[PDB]
Design a protein around this ligand. Sequence first.
Ligand SMILES: [K+]
Ligand SMILES: [K+]
Ligand SMILES: [K+]
Ligand SMILES: [K+]
Ligand SMILES: [K+]
Ligand SMILES: [K+]
Ligand SMILES: [K+]
Ligand SMILES: [K+]
Ligand SMILES: [K+]
Ligand SMILES: [K+]
Ligand SMILES: [K+]
Ligand SMILES: [K+]
Ligand SMILES: [K+]
Ligand SMILES: [K+]
Ligand SMILES: [Mg+2]
Ligand SMILES: [Mg+2]
Ligand SMILES: [Mg+2]
Ligand SMILES: [Mg+2]
Ligand SMILES: [Mg+2]
Ligand SMILES: [Mg+2]
Ligand SMILES: [Mg+2]
Ligand SMILES: [Mg+2]
Ligand SMILES: [Mg+2]
Ligand SMILES: [Mg+2]
Ligand SMILES: [Mg+2]
Ligand SMILES: [Mg+2]
Ligand SMILES: [Mg+2]
Ligand SMILES: [Mg+2]
Ligand SMILES: [Mg+2]
Ligand SMILES: [Mg+2]
Ligand SMILES: [Mg+2]
Ligand SMILES: [Mg+2]
Ligand SMILES: [Mg+2]
Ligand SMILES: [Mg+2]
Ligand SMILES: [Mg+2]
Ligand SMILES: [Mg+2]
Ligand SMILES: [Mg+2]
Ligand SMILES: [Mg+2]
Ligand SMILES: [Mg+2]
Ligand SMILES: [Mg+2]
Ligand SMILES: [Mg+2]
Ligand SMILES: [Mg+2]
Ligand SMILES: [Mg+2]
Ligand SMILES: [Mg+2]
Ligand SMILES: [Mg+2]
Ligand SMILES: [Mg+2]
Ligand SMILES: [Mg+2]
Ligand SMILES: [Mg+2]
Ligand SMILES: [Mg+2]
Ligand SMILES: [Mg+2]
Ligand SMILES: [Mg+2]
Ligand SMILES: [Mg+2]
Ligand SMILES: [Mg+2]
Ligand SMILES: [Mg+2]
Ligand SMILES: [Mg+2]
Ligand SMILES: [Mg+2]
Ligand SMILES: [Mg+2]
Ligand SMILES: [Mg+2]
Ligand SMILES: [Mg+2]
Ligand SMILES: [Mg+2]
Ligand SMILES: [Mg+2]
Ligand SMILES: [Mg+2]
Ligand SMILES: [Mg+2]
Ligand SMILES: [Mg+2]
Ligand SMILES: [Mg+2]
Ligand SMILES: [Mg+2]
Ligand SMILES: [Mg+2]
Ligand SMILES: [Mg+2]
Ligand SMILES: [Mg+2]
Ligand SMILES: [Mg+2]
Ligand SMILES: [Mg+2]
Ligand SMILES: [Mg+2]
Ligand SMILES: [Mg+2]
Ligand SMILES: [Mg+2]
Ligand SMILES: [Mg+2]
Ligand SMILES: [Mg+2]
Ligand SMILES: [Zn+2]
Lengths: 25, 141, 150, 98, 129
Amino acid sequence: MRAKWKKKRMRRLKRKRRKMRQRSK
Amino acid sequence: GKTRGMGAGRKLKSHRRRQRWADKSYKKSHLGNEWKKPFAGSSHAKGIVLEKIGIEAKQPNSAIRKCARVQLIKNGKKIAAFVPNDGCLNYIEENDEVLIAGFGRKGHAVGDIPGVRFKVVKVSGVSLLALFKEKKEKPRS
Amino acid sequence: GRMHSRGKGISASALPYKRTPPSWLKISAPDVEDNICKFAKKGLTPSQIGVILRDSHGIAQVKSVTGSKILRILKAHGLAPEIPEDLYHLIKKAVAIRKHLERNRKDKDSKFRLILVESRIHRLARYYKKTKKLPPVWKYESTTASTLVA
Amino acid sequence: TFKRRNGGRNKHGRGHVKFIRCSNCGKCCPKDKAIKRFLVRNIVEQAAVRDVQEACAFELYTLPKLYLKMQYCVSCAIHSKVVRVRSRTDRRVREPPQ
Amino acid sequence: VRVSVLNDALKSMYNAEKAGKAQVELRPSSKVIIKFLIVMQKHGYIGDFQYVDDHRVGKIVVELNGRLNKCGVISPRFDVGVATIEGWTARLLPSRQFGYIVLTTSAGIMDHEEARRKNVGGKVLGFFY
RNA sequence: GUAGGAUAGUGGCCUACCAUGGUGGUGACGGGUGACGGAGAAUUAGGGUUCGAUUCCGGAGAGGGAGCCUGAGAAACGGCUACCACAUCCAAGGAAGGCAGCAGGCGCGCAAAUUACCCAAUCCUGACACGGGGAGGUAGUGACAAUAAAUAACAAUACCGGGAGUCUGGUAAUUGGAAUGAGUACAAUCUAAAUCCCUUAACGAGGAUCCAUUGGAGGGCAAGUCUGGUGCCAGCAGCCGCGGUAAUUCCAGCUCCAAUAGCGUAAUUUAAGUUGUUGCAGUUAAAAAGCUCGUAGUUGGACUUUGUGUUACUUUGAAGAAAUUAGAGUGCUCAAAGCAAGCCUACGCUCUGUAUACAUUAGCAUGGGAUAACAUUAUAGGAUUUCGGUCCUAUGGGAUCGGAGUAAUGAUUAACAGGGACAGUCGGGGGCAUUCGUAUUUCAUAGUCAGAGGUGAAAUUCUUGGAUUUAUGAAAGACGAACAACUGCGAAAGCAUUUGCCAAGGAUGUUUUCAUUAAUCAAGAACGAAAGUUGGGGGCUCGAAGACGAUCAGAUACCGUCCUAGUCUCAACCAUAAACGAUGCCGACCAGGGAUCGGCGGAUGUUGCUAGGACUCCGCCGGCACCUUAUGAGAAAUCAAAGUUUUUGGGUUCCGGGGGGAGUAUGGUCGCAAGGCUGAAACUUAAAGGAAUUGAC
RNA sequence: AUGACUCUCUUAAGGUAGCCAAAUGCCUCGUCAUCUAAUUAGUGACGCGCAUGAAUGGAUUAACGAGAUUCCCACUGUCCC
RNA sequence: CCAACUCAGAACUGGUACGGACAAGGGGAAUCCGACUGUUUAAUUAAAACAAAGCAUUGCGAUGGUCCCAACGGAUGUUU
RNA sequence: AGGAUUGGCUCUGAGGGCUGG
Ligand SMILES: [K+]
Ligand SMILES: [K+]
Ligand SMILES: [K+]
Ligand SMILES: [K+]
Ligand SMILES: [K+]
Ligand SMILES: [K+]
Ligand SMILES: [K+]
Ligand SMILES: [K+]
Ligand SMILES: [K+]
Ligand SMILES: [K+]
Ligand SMILES: [K+]
Ligand SMILES: [K+]
Ligand SMILES: [K+]
Ligand SMILES: [K+]
Ligand SMILES: [Mg+2]
Ligand SMILES: [Mg+2]
Ligand SMILES: [Mg+2]
Ligand SMILES: [Mg+2]
Ligand SMILES: [Mg+2]
Ligand SMILES: [Mg+2]
Ligand SMILES: [Mg+2]
Ligand SMILES: [Mg+2]
Ligand SMILES: [Mg+2]
Ligand SMILES: [Mg+2]
Ligand SMILES: [Mg+2]
Ligand SMILES: [Mg+2]
Ligand SMILES: [Mg+2]
Ligand SMILES: [Mg+2]
Ligand SMILES: [Mg+2]
Ligand SMILES: [Mg+2]
Ligand SMILES: [Mg+2]
Ligand SMILES: [Mg+2]
Ligand SMILES: [Mg+2]
Ligand SMILES: [Mg+2]
Ligand SMILES: [Mg+2]
Ligand SMILES: [Mg+2]
Ligand SMILES: [Mg+2]
Ligand SMILES: [Mg+2]
Ligand SMILES: [Mg+2]
Ligand SMILES: [Mg+2]
Ligand SMILES: [Mg+2]
Ligand SMILES: [Mg+2]
Ligand SMILES: [Mg+2]
Ligand SMILES: [Mg+2]
Ligand SMILES: [Mg+2]
Ligand SMILES: [Mg+2]
Ligand SMILES: [Mg+2]
Ligand SMILES: [Mg+2]
Ligand SMILES: [Mg+2]
Ligand SMILES: [Mg+2]
Ligand SMILES: [Mg+2]
Ligand SMILES: [Mg+2]
Ligand SMILES: [Mg+2]
Ligand SMILES: [Mg+2]
Ligand SMILES: [Mg+2]
Ligand SMILES: [Mg+2]
Ligand SMILES: [Mg+2]
Ligand SMILES: [Mg+2]
Ligand SMILES: [Mg+2]
Ligand SMILES: [Mg+2]
Ligand SMILES: [Mg+2]
Ligand SMILES: [Mg+2]
Ligand SMILES: [Mg+2]
Ligand SMILES: [Mg+2]
Ligand SMILES: [Mg+2]
Ligand SMILES: [Mg+2]
Ligand SMILES: [Mg+2]
Ligand SMILES: [Mg+2]
Ligand SMILES: [Mg+2]
Ligand SMILES: [Mg+2]
Ligand SMILES: [Mg+2]
Ligand SMILES: [Mg+2]
Ligand SMILES: [Mg+2]
Ligand SMILES: [Mg+2]
Ligand SMILES: [Mg+2]
Ligand SMILES: [Mg+2]
Ligand SMILES: [Zn+2]
């Protein structure tokens, strides 16, 4: 996978964790 | 380049101190994570055989490596121990005391056996080598 | 090279091997020192006092005729400025940039050069304090810098 | 592996060069990197000069020329055969051909 | 900036000697460089060198004879007692039969062989052979 | 800090009062330690790495705390008191408990011995020549570790070689006589008593069964392409690999190899110049921060005698536990060891010996003064005699204030270091305002009439309500073509229409000035394409998202049409790019050549020109680069630096340590957000990767 | 087991980002976890959701509330009586 | 010489009493709704309803937008 | 959130103003 798109995938995955963790604080 | 000053003793010493952590061998011993291993820094360990299992050999080999899941007595951790030699699995019964040792690569997998880093040395207080060569017999029956 | 750039220029003066005055120079040392004091009272600095002597009096080097540098002569007569000439000009440049910079907030180039000039002021002022050419408590203040120079 | 000392462009002692748009496809390319050709030819093709000259309404008249400066990107220059792939030794020759 | 004038002097000589030059100019000059050259001259590694007075630091022109293999400084100038001279020679010299380490001692600048005779230690300036 | 209290005594040790200090990127404070410290131990060309619970020294504790008596000495534990935690006995009312002393038991574990004998040696203790001593010694167990050293030797035959012949050498469970301790045992000796060893009567070897083992035989790596079995099964294999019906690799036999009374398997040193101070890397292999400033830190030109300022450094010496290490002497039968012994033959001797070196750093004391650090210098509070005054004080001295002399009276040089001034220049460097340019879009007017647009081909789309096309004019917003380059400016990002204003700058020129003011930089700062974020303006063009038309097996794409955010600007943020020369900065040195940009010097004769400009020739300094070349470097590509490197050291910052996991998790910090900065581990893997070569495609 | 993917009918468009047995879920006291000795309650999850969903605004949210709700501690004649 | 009442500390003392009467928050972990302050059915509903700042859309350049009036005229408008 | 203190009495210390060279 192109490194740029793999970087894009990880950034998206970090938003979900950020939102999934702040859901319970 | 390197710092050369006659008064640069502190910087050279402190620089090397930070850079030694970049060495995998140095960091493995000074991290303290060795005590969290199933042996916890021990050469051998006794355990109880939970079940007798077979593990598919890794490619390009094709075989069923005879192993045995063992729970360590001193800490209760479960590991997979390879049983060497031909037909030695018949000498091992479930819920039996077996002495376990490393596989020879200091916690690393050996050969084509996937995810196995331990081997069985003794069963019921008798070495598998003696049983394999018919020197001794297990104490039962 | 340059302290605050990548320039590598080498242009400079080349003093002659002969430290004695030329045979065609008739002015005596007392006469030269009288002129130096006369120019100093008019506000001229050591740098531009020597230029006048070289160009209008034929005195290539004051030290050759008098045996002492221009600044030393002024100090002996109590005419040396409180702030050294070179430090004085750096402060004047910093004041000019700040005055320009107050009317030009988007001139980021001037803002960059102001940092270089002020940092050069502090390095030079530090040296003069160590050599005791400035008051021990002397400190450069942007608010009151303009009052000092000009 | 570094293929060219100039990096495929002509830039020394400067940071940024504004790009131009390829005359063929419009691709953005730095001006110093684009392949530039200045074409000068008669506005009337040689196959029609005789007919146009015979129909000229003036005793003397010089047919104007058509000046066009063409700036190509690398892909279009190669595809259009404006430039060709050369051997490793011949890449260094900068003089125009015959 | 110029940190070690001795390094520039010896580096210039070493480069000139390898190129096969007969003369080489050293600038700036210093009394440490002159004393270092005298040690080399006494052992027949350089010819006649001449100091030029320019009223600022001076300059030196050194005549080369092709006998000098290498000459270089040791930086920083480590302390070397008499007992530790043997270790340094085993590191910097081609063999135990030729080559000199120049030391600066309270008795003056001299080669390591002279230092042993006088039993005086000091600091390492450089070496040549 | 003052005054007390307490203590054997100093001290915030404690009390009262008073002051506001004390420590810290030269790492305080806090955290971790499977951390008692040292003498030392292992390995070590050198430097170094790792270890140090344990017999010597120091400290600490006696299940956890606390308190205390006695005493010269204890905050004692084989002394007491209490609490807590465990636990013994009881007639249940009580009472007694401390093995991390020796032995022993349980438990824990991979992991460690006799519930033995003795005060004979060593030494300790008491009232004591005499008692006592699980200190200590002796024996038992003991393949921790270490030393020496058997398991055969010889001869004659048979057989087989070497230098027809004959000398030598090698094999055989052949045949012969010899040797001998393992064992066993009278004895003596040994010992506190026993035991072992040493010595020795008898006895004790031929398949001398008085039977050598542990790992191997594809490669690494010494040793079989032997035979049977198995058939990608079983297994081997540290790594590479072996096994799918003819296995040198598995299971066996045989043979062979290595070590050998030992050998195999499962933290740490070496190998590792893969932690690099000696001594490694960072153009492309992992690795220069986007750029500059900047404090601490680190590093800093030359110059002063050659012919009571303070330190570092160096020399020598004193002090410094033993044991261990190195090492002198010495025939315990050798040896590891031990510290003994030797000499002669008397009532003994050699005064017998029991050396010596090493021992970082810090501290102490002499000699040396090159190199180096800090401090110091010009209104000398200067040096130097001499002449007074005044004050204080002994059997003159001290302090202080003056006069007159003496003298060469007292300031290194100005770095092809740096700063500053000045001079004429140069530049698409920056800011503010302002001028101009065609094009695009839109509209108006006028003209014309069926198509225009777009594509490989088409379609969505527009059109007699006049599309596209043509001329004129206006508005709007953006952009600044050609000139324009292996050219310029800028710290980088970046910067290109005119003119004015504002401040800034490099280089050049300089017989101007200061005189080391410097180089590089943790912390901390300024700037930082594009995209993005908040709001206002503007909104031509282009155009993420969206919709649609095509293509296609499908096409959320590439092509086409329309279009939102955006694209421009202002205010405020964001701080990231292949922010690249994938190459940090300062300094020196080391080939040649032409061109070019800026400045200056010299020479020269032309200009539809007003000494100068333009051009021509020579040279100097500075800059962007290029070309040839190896005497260089490199894995090579290639590099005039990426050279001057095992012949290794000019200064300094950042930064890398197989590939992944991963720039992820977590904590902190910055941001409105997007995210930035800082930044792991578990686990996984034998390759990934760089340059170049031949093929195939 | 499930259905990324494919086929097929079809709409102006086929519910996207989110959220949920919710003050919105009929079935229903839904299923799992948690809280209790025991919970049709509460909370956290799951979602083919009878009939959730984006200024008919969706999802969050510190502070605030004589607003609705569950639990724990204190407190008690609410209760044992 | 003349001063008012704040703060801090110590000793002693009572049946541990002492903000002695009076006065004067219970506290904590969460869910739903509404951001908040404000307002509301006088006499059964004080709320999650209304309002609210913020956000967005629409009309209108006065010969006009919205609205009143039987007619004339008028409100927004002392406005843009 | 959580914890401590609070009476009476007898004292001590600290915090000011106006005149006088
Ligand atoms: K090191
Ligand atoms: K200059
Ligand atoms: K090109
Ligand atoms: K005391
Ligand atoms: K005190
Ligand atoms: K006593
Ligand atoms: K005894
Ligand atoms: K005794
Ligand atoms: K070496
Ligand atoms: K910034
Ligand atoms: K040049
Ligand atoms: K309410
Ligand atoms: K209120
Ligand atoms: K109206
Ligand atoms: Mg270097
Ligand atoms: Mg230079
Ligand atoms: Mg700098
Ligand atoms: Mg390529
Ligand atoms: Mg440049
Ligand atoms: Mg760029
Ligand atoms: Mg005291
Ligand atoms: Mg006190
Ligand atoms: Mg330790
Ligand atoms: Mg411990
Ligand atoms: Mg120890
Ligand atoms: Mg321990
Ligand atoms: Mg022990
Ligand atoms: Mg001890
Ligand atoms: Mg004790
Ligand atoms: Mg115990
Ligand atoms: Mg005790
Ligand atoms: Mg005891
Ligand atoms: Mg005791
Ligand atoms: Mg053991
Ligand atoms: Mg045997
Ligand atoms: Mg024997
Ligand atoms: Mg075999
Ligand atoms: Mg072999
Ligand atoms: Mg076979
Ligand atoms: Mg093998
Ligand atoms: Mg390594
Ligand atoms: Mg390496
Ligand atoms: Mg790469
Ligand atoms: Mg790389
Ligand atoms: Mg120096
Ligand atoms: Mg100079
Ligand atoms: Mg233009
Ligand atoms: Mg130009
Ligand atoms: Mg920084
Ligand atoms: Mg930006
Ligand atoms: Mg980056
Ligand atoms: Mg980079
Ligand atoms: Mg840097
Ligand atoms: Mg860079
Ligand atoms: Mg020129
Ligand atoms: Mg070349
Ligand atoms: Mg090196
Ligand atoms: Mg790695
Ligand atoms: Mg949905
Ligand atoms: Mg639901
Ligand atoms: Mg329920
Ligand atoms: Mg309930
Ligand atoms: Mg729920
Ligand atoms: Mg609905
Ligand atoms: Mg909507
Ligand atoms: Mg709804
Ligand atoms: Mg919600
Ligand atoms: Mg809330
Ligand atoms: Mg309210
Ligand atoms: Mg909720
Ligand atoms: Mg409300
Ligand atoms: Mg009301
Ligand atoms: Mg009501
Ligand atoms: Mg009510
Ligand atoms: Mg809102
Ligand atoms: Mg009307
Ligand atoms: Zn193109």
